[PDB]
Design a protein around this ligand. Structure first.
Ligand SMILES: [Mg+2]
Ligand SMILES: [Mg+2]
Ligand SMILES: [Mg+2]
Ligand SMILES: [Mg+2]
Ligand SMILES: [Mg+2]
Ligand SMILES: [Mg+2]
Ligand SMILES: [Mg+2]
Ligand SMILES: [Mg+2]
Ligand SMILES: [Mg+2]
Ligand SMILES: [Mg+2]
Ligand SMILES: [Mg+2]
Ligand SMILES: [Mg+2]
Ligand SMILES: [Mg+2]
Ligand SMILES: [Mg+2]
Ligand SMILES: [Mg+2]
Ligand SMILES: [Mg+2]
Ligand SMILES: [Mg+2]
Ligand SMILES: [Mg+2]
Ligand SMILES: [Mg+2]
Ligand SMILES: [Mg+2]
Ligand SMILES: [Mg+2]
Ligand SMILES: [Mg+2]
Ligand SMILES: [Mg+2]
Ligand SMILES: [Mg+2]
Ligand SMILES: [Mg+2]
Ligand SMILES: [Mg+2]
Ligand SMILES: [Mg+2]
Ligand SMILES: [Mg+2]
Ligand SMILES: [Mg+2]
Ligand SMILES: [Mg+2]
Ligand SMILES: [Mg+2]
Ligand SMILES: [Mg+2]
Ligand SMILES: [Mg+2]
Ligand SMILES: [Mg+2]
Ligand SMILES: [Mg+2]
Ligand SMILES: [Mg+2]
Ligand SMILES: [Mg+2]
Ligand SMILES: [Mg+2]
Ligand SMILES: [Mg+2]
Ligand SMILES: [Mg+2]
Ligand SMILES: [Mg+2]
Ligand SMILES: [Mg+2]
Ligand SMILES: [Mg+2]
Ligand SMILES: [Mg+2]
Ligand SMILES: [Mg+2]
Lengths: 46, 259
RNA sequence: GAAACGAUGACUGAAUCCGCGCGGACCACCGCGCAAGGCUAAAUACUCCCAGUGACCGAUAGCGCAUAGUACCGUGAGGG
RNA sequence: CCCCCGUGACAGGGGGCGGAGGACCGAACCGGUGCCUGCUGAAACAGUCUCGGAUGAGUUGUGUUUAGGAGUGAAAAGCU
RNA sequence: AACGAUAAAAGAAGUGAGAAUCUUCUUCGCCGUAAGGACAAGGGUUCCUGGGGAAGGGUCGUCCGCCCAGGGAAAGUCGGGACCUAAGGUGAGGCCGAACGGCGCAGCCGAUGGACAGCAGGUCAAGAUUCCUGCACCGAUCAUGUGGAGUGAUGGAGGGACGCAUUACGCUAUCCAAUGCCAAGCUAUGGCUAUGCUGGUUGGUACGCUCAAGGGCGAUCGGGUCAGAAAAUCUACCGGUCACAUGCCUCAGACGUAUCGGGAGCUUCCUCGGAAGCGAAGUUGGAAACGCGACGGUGCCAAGAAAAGCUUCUAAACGUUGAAACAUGAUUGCCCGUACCGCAAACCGACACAGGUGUCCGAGUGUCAAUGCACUAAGGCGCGCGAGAGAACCCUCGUUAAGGAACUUUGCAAUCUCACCCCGUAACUUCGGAAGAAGGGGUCCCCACGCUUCGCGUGGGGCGCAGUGAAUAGGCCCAGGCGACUGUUUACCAAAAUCACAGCACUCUGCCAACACGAACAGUGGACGUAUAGGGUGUGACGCCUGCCCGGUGCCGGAAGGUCAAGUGGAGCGGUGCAAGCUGCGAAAUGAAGCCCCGGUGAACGGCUAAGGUAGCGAAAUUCCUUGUCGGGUAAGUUCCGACCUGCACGAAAGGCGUAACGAUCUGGGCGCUGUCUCAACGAGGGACUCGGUGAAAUUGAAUUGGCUGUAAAGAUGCGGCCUACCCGUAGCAGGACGAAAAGACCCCGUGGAGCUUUACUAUAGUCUGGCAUUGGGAU
RNA sequence: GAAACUUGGAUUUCUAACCUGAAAAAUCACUUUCGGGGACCGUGCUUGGCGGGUAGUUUGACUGGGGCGGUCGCC
RNA sequence: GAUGUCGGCUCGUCGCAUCCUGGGGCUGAAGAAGGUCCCAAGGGUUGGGCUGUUCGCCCAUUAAAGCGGCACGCGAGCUG
């Protein structure tokens, strides 16, 4: 019963990361969107 | 020659002259970004590249001596490791009957003797050559394989006739180089390949018949039990003859392409 | 469509003041205008924010929150 | 490869020796054959027993790459 | 109902408001290729100490991985970075593109790999190649002495450098034996009085003429310039002289000597249990790696990263007087990680979950061998409800008279068989196999003699019902069907006769190849391949083999003709103006690829009118009637084998018929065994039951909820009539409550949906083709 | 009937467009020495063709269930 | 907004249009053995081969090897 989630810090951070959302503008859209949702918390700090 | 036995196989090949020596790395891959373009080919064992001299021009006027004749993967062609008087070692594909320690002169004035690698205007008619330079300069795109040959037929002005392995006759100008003799690797073709996975030592996972796939996957897909309709590939073109060439420059340099 | 006029993608390629374009096939006549150069307040839209107000709410209502995008759910976008 | 016998249309045969194999039995590991059990489970797919592979088309870690009419697929329309 | 594995507990002592559950003791049981130990991931203080007891803990709690506070984490040398590079990522210039953006040489990023200086011990409650002690090592700057000269680049070279299998020699780790040593003491039960019992029995460094397997080593003089951009004393080559035994070179490791450690224990104060001191001998014999000597040896095809450090050479430069190099102190040593969990109560699984998780170590005895199997060291643990009871029923087991498959869809399940040695072994075969065929014997102990060893051989003696005395442990055979085969597949009902498979065939493709991804005259895959290659398609080892029909559909080939678009072009027709003129529909000719037309094509779509089944097979995975007819087997045979043929509706690469071997494949039979059965019994354990703790769920119009029979929307507790029936529970059963579950998945309906198909409609990516540009000159 | 300022067409060929390879300079860029191809190919605009490769959809009703058979208006 | 379908197994229970047994009338019934009709539901009504089969055919028996109902009785009982 190998499940789905395999914590791997480097994986997690290299997809999904603040840096990673810089890479692209769909990402940068996500960022601004979230900033706007009210101080949410964000992608790297979690 | 071959090996023969019981325990479930047939026919490996046999080779002399062993070194393991001096050229670049290569790395296997199939897909190219997204969906695999050239199909299958995901298996294979760890080959290395051997830089081989097709051009063989700048060595003009300079004789060489065969060091050894070596096995190279990614090939089907015996390669002779050449050494020149210059000191420069260069891998050149080895033709049939080319011995070890023979002497191969390069350049245009060199006699139509084995391996001597000359242009066509100096090659007497009917003679057998391999490794044929298509456009003067660059290199040989023609007859690089096993047991493959070309026969020179009477030239035109700067241009010569050649019979390529396919049987097709080609206009190729005499300004182009070629190597004397045919390139054997004996007869490679009659190797048995034994069982599967041997086909996997190299390429990978061969034909998956569209007829076992599904309507979603292939035109052949679907139905109840083994059958057919149609007759066509990934996209509806077909097995049998459809001239796939486009009307073009090259097409005027071909005389009687048949087969 | 009887389809004028504007607008370009391809290809042609003019006149210039008794000249040029328009007036909804087109022609004459009668009128209207002078392209292929530029810039240009004001009345106009919006509400993150601030003020005032209300036959608006008053704790299952009113924004989701009488503060929380928190707890919590998700790999993530996201949701709450 | 090294010895001996043998070559009448016939191939070979024996001993030494060697260490080949999608060879064999079998733990690890990979896998799920059949029964039972479990069925508001220990568990949103297992347990016991039994069974398959077990130097190969093998198993496995890390890093990467491929995705929505798209990918991937020893091909179920399976997986994403 | 349940309290999360049937590995198991018991007593005493203690603390406390309260103890089955926390502490201590002593026993018991469980794991021990782990249920021990070390990392990596991941998790974050879960670690240690002192408190605490709401809640979390499936009960309890004084206890905890919970709550509170306080401490704990130490590096020039380990792992990472200031080093290198792989796939991939990026990428100035550069190539494309409605935008956003997609590519891309060099270069740079990127460990999963290369490179690289330390070992032995000690200890906080909690750290350890990190602190401490012992000796050590690497680089860097400076200082003293030698030297007393060259140094050696963003550049060349050499080197780093690489596979699988198998295997010789020598070790060590490491384990075993003993009347070797050392150390402590006792002993009783019947004996032993040590020859018994218990424990320990060496780690680092340095030196050394000692022992030592194995490992790899050429050298200079020189020639050509055409080689490495040029260079070069370097590297490649070529040639000459000294490399047939040697032998320079190296020590794994052993031995010695010394030294620093450690060592069983003994001592001593004990602040409730630790702390400090002291310190015995290290022997002979045997076993031994996947580690080390090494980059060993041999064989094989499928042919086994790169780059930097490293070594060598010059260009430039500075100096040739103070160089390089050596060693001699000295100084210098940055950043991050480092606790604890880490096959699990701390990671992923909603949970203190029977699941999952990459690597390393993983002792002893017995056992051909072993990481197997039993027990067991070290270590860890008894799985956070418990106590009685000994009903039904259920689960997991043990034994069973006579019989032996009669069970039943089917021997499903469960027996039987079971290792090793010997003897022995069939049809059939592709000569390998079938095969562990089948079958039969052996197996323990003691003594004697013999060999080649863990041991075995022979003889004799012994003991039990039995000697792989317990655990691990194949039942077998004869026939068929399907696929040859190993393999692959429906994560979570299908493992197959599916898929793939070597082999075969058709066909495409001449290289900016065909083909395929794609805004794209970008790039890339095909391929750093070149027809013995690559794409596509179908068959599907091997053996014999593969027939007839091209009329239609397609594909290839053909040119005399039939139609065929824009388009160059404008006779003609009509409008308006007095007029020159300006304007509307618009044709004969010129018009390509298509289609009609001809011919060929079948391991092309296909058919048995274009022809009608050539082998071979046939009631077959194809068969209707049908349990066909005969025969085999059986007391009895709708299945099964064999024929036959009347083939409803076999047939030759959607292959025909065969075929050894293969198979958790499907079918029929036989042997053996047997609780499957006649037909069930007794026994065990874990639930069920009872007491104490904690305490769910689906469901639920409400209920004061009987039987018959009749009615009612056509299956009555609830209406009628008649019968029965004191109140309430506990254990049980499964007939009813059209019992629960999911707004039936069948069916039908909806001018509802979506996947798929094609000679349905319509467009379209793609692709073909004429004209027009890019687009020029000269000849006929 | 010859000459020409000439205009299009097919042929042939050429090199200055363009494509493309080697060369010390891995993709480009270049004076480049060159080599091959070449008014083609490609490419843009249009013309006609093919196009289940893909896309959007269509595929009636009555009916002693639906389907099949039949039946839809008129006398 | 679900009344689970064949057959078996298990467990029964009812009807009588009686397969057996019991009591009768007639018989073209001497006896013995039958034929047929009436009365009669207390009890009884075997084991295998073939088949998923109910059925049916067969083996060996028997006093006999009845026919049907019970949602073609019975899956909150089992199978499958
Ligand atoms: Mg299929
Ligand atoms: Mg299709
Ligand atoms: Mg099809
Ligand atoms: Mg206009
Ligand atoms: Mg209130
Ligand atoms: Mg609110
Ligand atoms: Mg094997
Ligand atoms: Mg209970
Ligand atoms: Mg428990
Ligand atoms: Mg603790
Ligand atoms: Mg408490
Ligand atoms: Mg509690
Ligand atoms: Mg002893
Ligand atoms: Mg005593
Ligand atoms: Mg001792
Ligand atoms: Mg630690
Ligand atoms: Mg667990
Ligand atoms: Mg595992
Ligand atoms: Mg071991
Ligand atoms: Mg062991
Ligand atoms: Mg074990
Ligand atoms: Mg109990
Ligand atoms: Mg018995
Ligand atoms: Mg007995
Ligand atoms: Mg008996
Ligand atoms: Mg029976
Ligand atoms: Mg069985
Ligand atoms: Mg006896
Ligand atoms: Mg067994
Ligand atoms: Mg198979
Ligand atoms: Mg499945
Ligand atoms: Mg399965
Ligand atoms: Mg198999
Ligand atoms: Mg209770
Ligand atoms: Mg009432
Ligand atoms: Mg009533
Ligand atoms: Mg029950
Ligand atoms: Mg219901
Ligand atoms: Mg419904
Ligand atoms: Mg469609
Ligand atoms: Mg209901
Ligand atoms: Mg009666
Ligand atoms: Mg009925
Ligand atoms: Mg029924
Ligand atoms: Mg079934």
């Amino acid at each position: 019963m190998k499940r789905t989630y395999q914590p791997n810090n480097r994986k997690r951070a290299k997809t999904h990361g603040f840096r990673a959302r810089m890479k692209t503008k769909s990402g940068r859209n996500i960022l601004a969107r979230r900033r706007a949702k009210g101080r949410h918390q964000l992608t790297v700090s979690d | 020659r071959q090996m023969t036995t019981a325990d479930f196989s047939g026919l490996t090949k046999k080779r002399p002259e062993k070194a393991l020596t001096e050229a670049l790395p290569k790395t296997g891959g199939r897909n190219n970004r997204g969906r695999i373009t050239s199909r299958f080919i995901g298996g294979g064992h760890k080959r290395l590249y051997r830089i081989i001299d097709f051009k063989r021009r700048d060595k003009s006027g300079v004789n060489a001596k065969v060091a050894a004749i070596e096995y190279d993967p990614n090939r089907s062609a015996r390669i002779a490791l050449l050494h020149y008087a210059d000191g420069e070692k260069r891998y050149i594909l080895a033709p049939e009957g080319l011995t070890v320690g023979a002497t191969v002169n390069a350049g245009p004035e060199a006699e139509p003797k084995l391996g001597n690698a000359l242009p066509l205007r100096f090659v007497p008619v009917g003679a057998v050559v391999h490794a044929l330079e298509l456009v003067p300069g660059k290199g040989a795109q023609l007859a690089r394989s096993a047991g493959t040959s070309v026969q020179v037929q009477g030239k035109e002005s700067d241009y010569v006739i050649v019979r390529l392995p396919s049987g097709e006759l080609r206009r190729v100008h005499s300004e182009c180089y070629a190597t004397i003799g045919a390139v054997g690797n004996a007869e490679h073709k009659n190797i048995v390949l034994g069982k599967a996975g041997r086909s996997r030592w190299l390429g990978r996972k061969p034909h998956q018949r569209g007829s076992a796939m599904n309507p979603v996957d292939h035109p052949h897909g679907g139905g109840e039990g083994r059958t057919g309709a149609g007759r066509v590939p990934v996209t509806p073109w077909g097995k049998p003859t459809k001239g796939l060439k486009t009307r073009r420059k090259r097409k005027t340099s071909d005389r009687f392409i048949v087969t």
